[PDB]
Write a protein that binds this DNA or RNA. Structure first.
Ligand code: K
Ligand code: MG
Ligand code: ZN
Lengths: 174, 165, 92, 159, 96
RNA sequence: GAGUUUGGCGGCCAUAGCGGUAGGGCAACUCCUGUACCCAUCCCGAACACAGCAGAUAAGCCUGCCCGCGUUCCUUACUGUACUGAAGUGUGCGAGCCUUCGGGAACUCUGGAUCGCUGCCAAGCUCA
RNA sequence: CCUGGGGCGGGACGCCCUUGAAAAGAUAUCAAGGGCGCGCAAUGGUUGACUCAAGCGGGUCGGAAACUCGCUGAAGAGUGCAAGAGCAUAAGUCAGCCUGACGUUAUUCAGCAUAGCAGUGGAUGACGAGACGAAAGUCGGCUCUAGCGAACUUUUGAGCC
RNA sequence: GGGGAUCCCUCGCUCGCUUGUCAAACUCCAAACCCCCCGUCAUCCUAGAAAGUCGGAGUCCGGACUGCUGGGGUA
């Protein structure tokens, strides 16, 4: 709303409402690569991003779309998919050589048992070192997909297929 | 997707003085809404009301969903489906102040309690106003996606048959 | 200003955070057997006594609140540099 | 108190009235004379000072009074438009003891004008050019600076 | 009378331009300088920690070490060599 | 392997803002549908959160355009003006001002442009 | 003692901000505007969630004075107190949990440019313990710059000589 | 909100678009001097740069010219 020469417009990423620069400053002071976990309504995405004066650089990247080749047919936008994507991201980053980072959830609310923390647990369980406290993780049953009992009978196959996708994703990086 | 759905319906009771009357007003409002009400606090001490800063004055409750629809239909029945142009906001919002809480079935007049009036406000939005309410990527909705007064009255007719005089 | 009577802080001796009770420090009576008291009695004679005939000076507008922090576990107190308040109470 | 006291500019501005106390109000009442709602006056002459000086509000008021009297007498009550362009913004002070704590008390206001700066502008018809010229000449006699009249609009309409 | 505080005569020195007020770009806070590098001291008023004296505003210092987040600079002040500690938010590399 | 669409994180932080106009979604995003659950409301599944078969490009988002206000840059006039570094047996009754050599605006004006540019990665795709 | 002689008046006699001060720094006067000799277990720390002032429109003797809804609103508010500076997904407001308003200790700044000088004060560290928080971090009080005092003496604290 | 029962009608401030003026302690702008650093030429420097240590001091009544519209002041 540029009223005049004395008006101050925010940064572009702040105008778009996509970044918190105070949090970003707090995260950059680590001098560690950020494990950037973002989720849309239909899938979840994880990145390993290091800062540069010219702009952020990404080291590793896993999306929910990559799980479907390993034998996953459930929804990509729930806890099991988020955990599996986190596991794949951690294993891929270990293959690349990068093995440390801090969790960057950005503007996403921090809620125990969230998809973000399921992806975080998947990253942790792959050996990828990242500071955290276990109380924010989802229960292991709902990482397996016990919410399938809610309304859908077809969702009842989520635990065994989650185990199968997990074992195949481990095998790809074994 | 331009049908002006009902974003929320709000019932507010501005008693102006706390105490037993405030509790009775909040209980009757919660009874007439079927939802917990929340106390409104004054912002400037005034010797006319003899109140201080940050002290309970009234109560209001936000209703969303079929509860809002049912309360809105009852409240419009109390005015007999009538609502004129001056009631409406400049952007599709209305409100009107009824007097007797006795018009809502399920509550009895009390000689001690008296009769407290209240004002009801329903805010008309469009399907997608989450853009200015969600946390991430929050953008102001354009002016072409807001709701006009004539659009609001047309919606009220086609949804409740509440004629506007 | 008010300070709590008991709060958790660092004990320099046990080297941990324990509950500590705050106690106001009372100034003691000066001993008559200290070297300055003996010197005053020795310099007492006929005439001016030097520094022992000085009258005590004035006072600052507010004095510091002399507080002592005793650990509830080791029962040892330590005293820190303290604030300067006109009115001081304990929060109970 | 002669105008030669607060006449020369040797100092910085003294105008921020929230950091001072008690300025006497200005004597100049109006700043627009004649017919204020007329703009189709073809001839427009102005009085420009030719030195950097400070003009006290009383000098401005005296010059304005004399010029306005001459214009009203000659061209009539609405045969002219006259504008006093400058406002007295500077606060004049005086030291009223000796040189100890000599920072003065506010005694008046003055306009700090630059060389070639317009003080008064007069707009009249073609036939009243010499009367406006004469009135502005009388006004400049009340000012603490040498002055000169210039024709701003309608030079070809006079000669 | 006139004081002797650190913030003496800092009205415009420690002021921001109109369209740079607020949260500063965070890239300036995570820049690294090598030993012996020449950096300018351009104090950011919004970063109130690790700020050198305004007397060293506008000076180029040589990086001589690091003391945590801050950098130790050798900054010339008149005819003396002063050791100035600064967070990178107030620093800026010299460009050749 | 080159480019594109979309998504994520960014850099510079209005040349990017405010406003108006016309087009798009196969994937992606999104609005959107619910509230068994993890999580939530000083009341409200509005938000946050979770789980998502449909509907939808009306919004967000993207692409095209518009000089309308704001901004930024150029151009002409103002103008080598204002101011100013150095020097001066130049000058004024004075407050001051001038000449030479060297720097040099701001505002306004004439006419233009500016309705962001850009880094990393990923995924769909378009290949010889 | 300062002092446009001295005296009367006053304190420009300690500390902090703006101007003076001439776009690095320094810079005098009984120069101009002034302020401080405090207040606060919350008016402090952290996390989460929110966004302020003021207008416009809607709402019942709830008046153009209350409370509430919507729109506009980079801040026109608030941040304890001078002045200046800083701050908006906050340095502001509310709430949850807390006491880092922690013991010890090293440098370098700046009082005191350049360029010696003190009690101090303020930045960056180290050691030892913690609070909050997914973590990153933040916290050595209250956004930054005022709120204070040598030697000797006594009293108090811990352990020693 | 100023003037002599339908507040029967008169209108000062307040908010904008144009006009005219301002600022030590205003700034959307913005020089010339100047300051730190880098390179360069120039000058000094092994007949000793910069740096360091030690011996001896005087000095802390200044004044003037040319500028800074320097501040104060009628001057
Ligand atoms: K004298
Ligand atoms: Mg004397
Ligand atoms: Zn203890």
């Amino acid at each position: 709303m540029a009223t005049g020469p004395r008006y101050k417009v925010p940064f572009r990423r702040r105008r778009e409402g996509r970044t918190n620069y105070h949090l970003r400053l707090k995260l950059l002071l680590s001098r560690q690569d950020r494990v950037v976990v973002r989720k849309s309504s239909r899938n979840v995405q994880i990145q390993l991003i290091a800062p540069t004066p010219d702009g952020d650089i990404t080291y590793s990247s896993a999306v929910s779309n990559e799980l479907a080749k390993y034998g996953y047919t459930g929804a990509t936008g729930n806890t099991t998919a988020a955990y599996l994507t986190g596991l794949l991201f951690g294993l891929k980053s270990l293959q690349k050589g990068y093995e440390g980072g801090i969790l960057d959830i950005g503007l996403q609310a921090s809620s125990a048992g969230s998809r973000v923390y399921a992806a975080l647990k998947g990253v942790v369980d792959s050996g990828f070192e990242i500071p955290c406290s276990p109380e924010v993780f989802p229960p292991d049953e709902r990482i397996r997909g016990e919410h399938i009992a809610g309304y859908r009978e077809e969702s009842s196959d989520l635990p065994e297929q989650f185990e199968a996708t997990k074992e195949k994703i481990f095998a790809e990086f074994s | 997707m331009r049908t002006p759905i009902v974003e929320k319906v709000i019932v507010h009771m501005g008693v102006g003085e706390s105490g037993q009357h405030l509790v009775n007003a909040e209980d009757i409002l919660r009874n007439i809404t079927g939802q917990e009400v929340v106390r409104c606090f004054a912002k400037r001490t005034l010797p006319a009301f003899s109140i201080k800063k940050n002290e309970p004055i009234g109560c209001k409750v936000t209703l969303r969903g079929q509860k809002a629809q049912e309360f809105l239909e009852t409240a419009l029945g109390i005015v007999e489906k009538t609502l004129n142009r001056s009631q409406f906001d400049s952007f599709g919002n209305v409100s009107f102040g009824i007097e007797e809480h006795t018009d809502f079935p399920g509550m009895r007049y009390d000689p001690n309690i008296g009769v407290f009036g209240m004002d009801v406000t329903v805010v008309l939005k469009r399907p997608g106003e989450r853009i200015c309410k969600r946390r991430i990527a929050a953008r102001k909705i354009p002016a072409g996606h807001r709701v006009t007064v004539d659009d609001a009255i047309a919606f009220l007719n086609e949804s409740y048959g509440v004629e506007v005089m | 200003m008010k300070i709590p009577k008991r709060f958790r802080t660092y004990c320099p001796f046990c080297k941990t955070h324990n509950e500590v009770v705050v106690e106001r420090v009372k100034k003691g009576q000066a001993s008559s057997m200290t070297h300055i008291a003996r010197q005053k009695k020795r310099q007492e004679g006929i005439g001016n006594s030097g520094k022992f005939s000085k009258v005590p000076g004035g006072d600052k507008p507010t004095k510091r609140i002399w507080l002592r922090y005793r650990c509830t576990v080791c029962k040892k107190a330590h005293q820190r540099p303290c604030f300067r308040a006109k009115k001081f109470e304990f929060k109970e | 108190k002669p105008g030669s006291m607060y006449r020369n500019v040797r100092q910085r501005s003294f105008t921020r009235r929230k950091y001072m106390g008690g300025v006497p109000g200005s004597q100049v009442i109006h700043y627009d004379m004649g017919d204020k709602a007329n703009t189709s006056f073809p001839v427009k002459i102005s009085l420009i000072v030719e030195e950097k000086c400070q003009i006290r509000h009383t000098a401005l008021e005296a010059a304005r009074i004399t010029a306005n009297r001459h214009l009203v007498a000659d061209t009539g009550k609405m045969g002219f438009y006259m504008k006093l362009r400058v406002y007295p913004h500077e606060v004049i002070r005086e030291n009223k003891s000796g040189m100890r704590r000599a920072f003065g008390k506010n005694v008046g206001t003055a306009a700090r004008v630059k060389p070639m700066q317009k003080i008064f502008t007069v707009a009249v018809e073609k036939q009243n050019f010499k009367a406006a010229k004469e009135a502005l000449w009388h006004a400049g006699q009340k000012l603490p600076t040498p002055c000169r009249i210039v024709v701003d609009e309608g030079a070809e309409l006079v000669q | 009378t006139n004081s002797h505080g650190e913030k003496r005569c800092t009205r415009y020195k420690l002021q921001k331009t109109v369209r740079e007020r607020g949260i500063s770009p965070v890239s300036r806070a995570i820049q690294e300088f090598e030993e012996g590098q020449m950096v300018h001291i351009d104090i950011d008023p919004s970063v109130q920690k690790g700020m050198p004296n305004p007397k060293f505003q506008g000076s180029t210092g040589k990086v001589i070490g690091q003391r945590g987040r801050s950098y130790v600079l050798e900054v010339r002040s008149g005819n003396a060599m002063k050791e100035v500690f600064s967070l990178p938010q107030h620093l800026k590399p010299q460009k050749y």
